[PDB]
């Protein structure tokens, strides 16, 4: 943020600090009696967060590669053919 030639990487690397602190926001929000005893079920799930993500989002790729193949898609750019093949 102080280095003037890197405001575009300074725009993309600090937006994750907004949500990394939002984990710390929910960290002090283990308080309420309907919240606390059942935000411990996501404490039964924090590594399992990494589980079903790495399940289903890799299983997303099992469709996401399978979609563009038979049809003749033609939209390509530098880092938007990845849009017209992978991000869509």
């Amino acid at each position: 943020r102080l280095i003037p030639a890197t405001l575009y990487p300074g725009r993309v690397i600090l937006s994750l600090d907004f949500i990394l602190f939002c984990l710390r926001l929910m960290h002090i929000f283990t308080i309420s009696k309907t919240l606390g005893p059942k935000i411990i079920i996501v404490k039964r799930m924090m590594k399992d967060v990494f589980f079903f993500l790495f399940l289903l989002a890799v299983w997303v790729v099992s469709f996401g590669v399978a979609k563009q193949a038979i049809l003749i898609h033609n939209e390509r750019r530098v880092d938007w053919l990845f849009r017209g093949a992978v991000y869509h």
Binding site: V65, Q68, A69, A85
Partner: protein, 89 residues
């Protein structure tokens, strides 16, 4: 890690197969095409390692019924017979 190195070889062979359907749609055996023939020679000969692994020393067709008793083994060679129906096209 013999599990891990086999997985990421198999995780990236389908990436290698994803290369030759998008850009490399050519009617010739190209540069990045000949390895898949040597990749299909590499894995079905691991069944050749398993056929010679632990048999009875007289029954050649009575051990292979156990591989016929595995539908995932029929999903292995069933994904080989479809490649012979895919390579010939």
């Amino acid at each position: 890690v013999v599990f891990h190195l086999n997985i990421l070889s198999y995780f990236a062979f389908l990436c290698l197969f994803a290369y030759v359907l998008m850009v490399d749609f050519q009617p010739v055996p190209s540069w990045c095409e000949c390895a898949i023939y040597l990749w299909l020679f590499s894995l079905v000969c691991e069944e050749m390692r398993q056929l010679f692994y632990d048999p009875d020393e007289c029954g050649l067709m009575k051990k292979a019924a156990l591989y016929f008793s595995d539908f995932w083994n029929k999903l292995d060679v069933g994904a080989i017979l479809l490649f012979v129906a895919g390579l010939t096209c």
